[PDB]
Design a protein around this motif. Structure first.
Motif, mmCIF file in Angstrom:
data_model
loop_
_atom_site.group_PDB
_atom_site.id
_atom_site.type_symbol
_atom_site.label_atom_id
_atom_site.label_comp_id
_atom_site.label_asym_id
_atom_site.label_seq_id
_atom_site.Cartn_x
_atom_site.Cartn_y
_atom_site.Cartn_z
ATOM 1 N N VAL A 489 115.157 17.466 -2.121
ATOM 2 C CA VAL A 489 114.733 16.828 -1.479
ATOM 3 C C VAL A 489 114.532 15.429 -2.769
ATOM 4 C CG1 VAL A 489 113.057 16.211 -0.726
ATOM 5 C CG2 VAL A 489 113.280 18.027 0.237
ATOM 6 N N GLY A 490 114.855 14.126 -1.970
ATOM 7 C CA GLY A 490 114.896 13.033 -3.336
ATOM 8 C C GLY A 490 115.821 12.927 -4.240
ATOM 9 N N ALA A 491 116.419 11.483 -4.970
ATOM 10 C CA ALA A 491 117.062 11.776 -5.586
ATOM 11 C C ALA A 491 116.066 11.241 -6.545
ATOM 12 C CB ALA A 491 118.655 10.471 -5.181
ATOM 13 N N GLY A 492 117.709 10.992 -8.227
ATOM 14 C CA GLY A 492 116.581 10.025 -9.404
ATOM 15 C C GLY A 492 115.424 10.532 -10.094
ATOM 16 N N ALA A 517 120.353 5.160 0.876
ATOM 17 C CA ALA A 517 122.158 6.191 1.212
ATOM 18 C C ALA A 517 122.610 5.527 0.069
ATOM 19 C CB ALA A 517 122.499 5.557 2.723
ATOM 20 N N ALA A 518 122.184 4.426 -0.377
ATOM 21 C CA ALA A 518 122.852 4.094 -1.900
ATOM 22 C C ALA A 518 122.757 4.364 -2.862
ATOM 23 C CB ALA A 518 122.112 2.233 -1.832
ATOM 24 N N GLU A 522 125.863 7.371 -5.407
ATOM 25 C CA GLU A 522 126.092 7.595 -6.380
ATOM 26 C C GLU A 522 126.445 9.036 -6.979
ATOM 27 O OE1 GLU A 522 126.479 5.156 -8.588
ATOM 28 O OE2 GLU A 522 126.678 3.861 -6.735
ATOM 29 N N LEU A 523 125.235 9.945 -6.040
ATOM 30 C CA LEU A 523 125.678 11.898 -6.644
ATOM 31 C C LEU A 523 126.911 12.175 -6.724
ATOM 32 C CD1 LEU A 523 122.657 10.944 -8.004
ATOM 33 C CD2 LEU A 523 121.463 12.976 -6.680
ATOM 34 N N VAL A 524 127.378 11.695 -5.193
ATOM 35 C CA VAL A 524 128.322 11.798 -5.052
ATOM 36 C C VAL A 524 129.661 12.477 -5.889
ATOM 37 C CG1 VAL A 524 129.930 12.118 -3.428
ATOM 38 C CG2 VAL A 524 127.264 11.987 -2.697
ATOM 39 N N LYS A 525 130.016 10.637 -6.179
ATOM 40 C CA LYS A 525 131.170 10.495 -7.760
ATOM 41 C C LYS A 525 130.882 10.938 -8.951
ATOM 42 C CE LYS A 525 131.002 6.268 -6.237
ATOM 43 N NZ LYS A 525 131.179 4.655 -6.070
ATOM 44 N N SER A 526 129.756 10.732 -8.998
ATOM 45 C CA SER A 526 129.500 11.917 -10.419
ATOM 46 C C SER A 526 130.080 12.722 -10.532
ATOM 47 C CB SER A 526 128.514 10.951 -10.621
ATOM 48 O OG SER A 526 127.071 11.253 -9.684
ATOM 49 N N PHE A 527 130.152 14.231 -9.734
ATOM 50 C CA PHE A 527 130.035 14.991 -9.834
ATOM 51 C C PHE A 527 131.226 16.022 -9.182
ATOM 52 C CE2 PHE A 527 124.795 15.422 -9.682
ATOM 53 C CZ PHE A 527 124.822 16.027 -11.111
ATOM 54 N N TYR A 531 131.058 21.342 -6.013
ATOM 55 C CA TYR A 531 129.348 21.039 -5.989
ATOM 56 C C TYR A 531 129.059 21.167 -4.147
ATOM 57 C CZ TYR A 531 128.692 21.314 -10.797
ATOM 58 O OH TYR A 531 129.273 21.523 -11.517
ATOM 59 N N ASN A 532 130.409 20.473 -3.238
ATOM 60 C CA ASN A 532 130.059 20.332 -1.944
ATOM 61 C C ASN A 532 129.083 19.456 -1.419
ATOM 62 O OD1 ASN A 532 131.830 22.585 -2.485
ATOM 63 N ND2 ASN A 532 132.738 21.961 -0.984
ATOM 64 N N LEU A 533 128.446 18.194 -1.902
ATOM 65 C CA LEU A 533 127.350 17.315 -2.358
ATOM 66 C C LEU A 533 126.921 16.701 -0.636
ATOM 67 C CD1 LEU A 533 126.899 15.915 -5.376
ATOM 68 C CD2 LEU A 533 125.044 17.805 -3.686
#
Lengths: 645, 638
Positions: A489-492, A517-518, A522-527, A531-533
């Motif tokens: 839950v939540g990013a950052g 979603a912005a 960012e967590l999708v391209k950096s992993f 991991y299947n985000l």
């Protein structure tokens, strides 16, 4: 590691959720004649991935008993979870199964944590996952010499401080039967988690076991193999039909081979000490133990020249007596220690004296660690580490330094000669990788560093926040390698360390919910791609989110639940409140300052999930920071009291 | 060594030098120019020629002094218009200053004896075979820490003066800082002029003031002159040919830490110590790991010709300072410890925790043992040095309860046997000293290899009470033993090895009197005095000892014998004031202490001094360590 584990005797499917197995109860698969026609197929056709728990009276009759012993002799594992007819049925559980574990009952939750920490290490042994490796640097091994550990059952966590192992002196008990020593091992596993050294010390080597009882000595050491101890202890003067009988069915339990000079006249340059070392290499022993007796301080320096010439096998070598304290201080692997609440006869030093004398001769240096960050007055890391340095009597200090740039902490903190490590709580986590020469695999995929220790050729850097989340799930019932999926839950904040933590626990797809979603893509391209985000953005997906059981709330819980983020999180917990494969589905929140957060109330009595607070992340990332800074395992009963009280 | 000593200086220590060596004395312009010649060549062997103060006024008269120098003489100055003519015409100097306390007078006349044992060449201090230490005085001026210098030098068997870090490196300053250490510390001086390449404040580009500084160590009579091994080779061959009897320590230090203890550079430096014939060789490394200490004990056993002060540095070389045997450098709280040297407490505390020592138990045994004051003396010395020993009492009347309760235990350290059991413990000593046979009582039983060692330290308490009050160790006087008590036989033995030509027994009654001559050798001449006319022929008596108990005030035949013996006191003038030593502890005012002091002006000594000096040599025998004297003297006197 390939075959099945027949369980005879709530812990069965927890074993299934450890190796990726699935339970096959034979009570639901269904008097004594149809129990034999069932034991033919599934003990052979379901020999891939099933934890075949049996009924109660399967051992009635010679039909399946010779079938169980046929599979127990063909490399299979027949396992017995001892609970507490029982004088008539348990005696066929003990002769059919080749491995035994005592699942005694636990009242407090700290005992129920140790029994799942000592059943990971038990199953990692009897299956073939990881044999108990010799510790790397300096290690201790507490010599529990009490005739009944229930007299000292309360203070067992204070005894095993600094110890990497316990030394169960089996002959010093009240009775050395098959049943009393199997009941004392259940006390150092419901109150500790360390490996056990199974010493049955004969009277010709300084103990209380009679030498003429060879048949009762073969049975005792063959029982410790069955209970999954990590270090069985043969003697080098044992008969050949007992050194070879133990070393042909040890399976995975390492063998320490011992010979003490109890009279105390052989100096460490005889051919008597080269032969007993060579007996240990010839019998394929993992550690040779050679104990002397010092009449002067030269025999301690005679021992430092003997260990140089003999580094084929790992060697324990020390000189007993009051004049051999230097050889006990300078000894690396498994230095025996003792406590004030234990009986002590061989004058082994405590952990407060072994670390003081190692400082008074210059093995430990008075190093200084620091914690850095801009709001550094509200920290509990100098509370945690200093109470760990005091328990182990290490000569270290942990202080604070408010900083904003990483250039000042080079001058005031890092470039000092007594610098021992850093701990980072700021956006300095991204900018302290400027100094790290060798980064771990955790620090590169997360892109954060909260530990900066010095090594050769520069500095090492590791993120322990993925330990701080993975360890907090393991201490609340979750297997280390389960088969569920995840949620964050939540990013950052510590969200990039939550996604790295959840995959290493074995989660297939990790579902990210956040109000923007912005910052979610960012967590999708950096992993990486394993991991299947999968971002959740509509409410139809939160119904079809598959197998979500480990949520980690990284959201700042000053703003309450946003609503546009919340209608999924109320719906994520709905479809997974009944799946309990090895563990009740649980949730963790990665911030410390409010004691109960908005998300944790809405998931623990409204949807039946276990909440673990933020202070349990501060200990477990400070436990792993204690191991990288010092080299010792931190005392958990004191770092958890200092971070709270 | 049998030649003269020409004492030069301004206008006491001259005839006290005559009384020490057993040498005679002759006190010494144009009438002086003729007579000063023949007394240098026919009064050559034997007279300590005390010369005048204006002898250096002449030009040629300074040259006849310098003729005595290069031949092998011991011309000597005792300390403004003539100091440039005194300090050049002398191959050894010495400094006498004004002293305040009797302890301050004590250390000057004790550090003069070891000086004059060194510069004459009889018995050099031979490289202490136990486990010694050395205090590293790192002070710019020792008058700052001067009130505590007796507390600084505790447990140290030598003093490491670092001459580079004095505030003035002048010849007047170093001779003043050696003057303020022989007043408070009767210890060997290690004269270290350390250069900047090895960690010091002396420069390397001024070689001339470094060579002339080590030459002040030869002439102020220090015990050990440090020479560096990466020094000029003209300096090495000058302070090894002109060293006299001052020994040479050769040091090399690795200030960087780029050598491990397997490199051939350490082998070449030991062979520079063997080829230059240095007494001790010194090698200081630097430990970057704890393995570097155990690489040193494998160097120390491969290089054993000359003794080796070998120890690493840094905070990872504390094992190499603890395991070192000869001259471990120690420091104090009151000194500028910069190379993080240990203190005397932390050296022994670490040696116990690694197993060099053991927790031993010492005892004092005897029947009336309730007021002994012997456990208070020793426990004040174990505490100052931080040794892990205890002292206690054990009331005994038979010797077999000592063997089965104290001796046979594994923590047995030694005994201190008191009056009713001294004769019985002699059967246990498998190695009795020569004093134990001659006296017939043993008061020290320490264990050795295969049995126990038995010594009688009662003679060295009767002796050292005299030497601590001004009596020379080998003077020419006669003695007197008043009484035939329990300590009577040690006092006869202590009086001969003090150097008395005659001992005169004078007793209360004559029953136990003639037995002392049949139980003592004929060399120890014991003339028994019988009548009052025989008191007149009793000559040169100035070292009396009283051991008559203080129950009977002196009267009868005995008082008249002593009354005419002490009357021939100070007029004989053997270099000291006539001394009496009461042997009884508790009666501080003995009537014989009054009648020799308030009537005939002797220097009388109470029996609290004998109880300390009996325990000081027992402390050296029990622990191997010299006892801190002020801490053990201020443990009995309460």
């Amino acid at each position: 590691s390939d075959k099945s584990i027949i369980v005879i005797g709530t812990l069965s499917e927890w074993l299934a959720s450890f190796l990726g197995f699935k339970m096959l109860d034979m009570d639901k698969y269904l008097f004594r004649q149809e129990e034999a026609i069932v034991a033919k197929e599934c003990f052979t056709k379901f020999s891939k991935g099933y934890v075949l728990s049996t009924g109660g009276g399967i051992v009635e009759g010679e039909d399946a008993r010779q079938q169980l012993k046929s599979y127990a002799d063909n490399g299979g594992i027949v396992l017995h979870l001892h609970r507490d007819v029982w004088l008539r049925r348990e005696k066929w559980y003990h002769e059919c199964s080749n491995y035994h574990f005592y699942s005694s009952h636990c009242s407090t939750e700290d005992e129920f944590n140790h029994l799942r920490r000592s059943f990971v290490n038990y199953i990692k042994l009897i299956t073939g996952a990881e044999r108990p490796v010799v510790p790397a640097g300096r290690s201790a091994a507490v010599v529990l010499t009490s005739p009944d550990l229930n007299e000292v059952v309360g203070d067992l966590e204070s005894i095993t401080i600094g110890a990497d192992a316990v030394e169960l002196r089996v002959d010093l008990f009240k009775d050395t039967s098959a049943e009393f020593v199997a009941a004392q091992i259940a006390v150092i596993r419901k109150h500790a988690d360390l490996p056990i050294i199974y010493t049955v010390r004969t009277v010709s080597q300084g103990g209380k076991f009679p030498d003429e009882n060879v048949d009762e000595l073969k049975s005792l050491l063959l029982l410790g193999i069955r209970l999954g101890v990590a270090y069985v202890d043969l003697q080098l003067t044992a008969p050949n039909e007992l050194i070879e009988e133990i070393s042909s069915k040890k399976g995975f339990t390492r063998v320490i081979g011992t010979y003490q000079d109890i009279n105390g006249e052989l100096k460490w340059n005889n051919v008597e000490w080269k032969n007993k070392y060579n007996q240990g290499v010839s019998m394929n022993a993992d550690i040779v133990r050679l104990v002397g007796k010092a009449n002067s301080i030269q025999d301690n320096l005679d021992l430092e020249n003997f260990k140089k010439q003999n580094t084929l096998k790992p060697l324990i070598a020390f000189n007993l007596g009051s004049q051999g304290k230097l050889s006990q201080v300078l000894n690396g692997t498994f230095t025996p220690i003792s406590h004030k609440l234990l009986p002590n006869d061989e004058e082994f030093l405590t952990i407060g004296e072994l670390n003081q004398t190692y400082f008074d001769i210059g093995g430990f240096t008075a190093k200084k660690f620091w914690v850095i960050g801009s709001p550094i007055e509200h920290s509990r890391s100098p509370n945690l580490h200093n109470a760990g340095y005091k328990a182990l009597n290490l000569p270290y200090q942990f202080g604070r330094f408010e900083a904003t740039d990483v250039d000042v902490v080079y001058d005031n903190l890092i470039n000092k000669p007594d610098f021992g490590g850093l701990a980072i709580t700021m956006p300095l986590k991204l900018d302290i990788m400027k100094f790290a020469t060798k980064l771990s695999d955790a620090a590169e995929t997360i892109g954060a560093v909260n530990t900066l220790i010095p090594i050769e050729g520069g500095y090492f850097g590791d993120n322990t926040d993925w330990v701080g989340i993975s360890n907090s799930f393991i201490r609340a019932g979750v297997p280390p390698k389960s088969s569920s999926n995840g949620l964050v839950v939540g990013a950052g904040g510590t969200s990039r360390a939550a996604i790295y933590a959840l995959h290493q626990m074995g989660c297939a797809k990790i579902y990210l919910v956040n109000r923007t979603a912005a910052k979610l893509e960012e967590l999708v391209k950096s992993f990486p791609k394993d991991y299947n985000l999968e971002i959740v953005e509509t409410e139809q997906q939160a119904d079809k989110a598959s197998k979500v059981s480990l949520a980690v709330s990284c959201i700042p819980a000053d703003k309450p639940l946003d609503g546009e983020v919340l209608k999924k999180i109320e719906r994520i917990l709905s479809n997974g409140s009944e799946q309990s494969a090895g563990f009740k589905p649980t949730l963790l929140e990665a911030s410390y300052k409010p004691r109960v957060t908005p998300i944790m109330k809405l998931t623990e009595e409204q949807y039946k999930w276990k909440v673990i607070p933020g202070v349990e992340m501060l200990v477990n990332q400070g436990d792993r920071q204690f191991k990288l800074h010092t080299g010792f395992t931190a005392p958990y009963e004191i770092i958890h009291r200092a971070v709270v009280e």
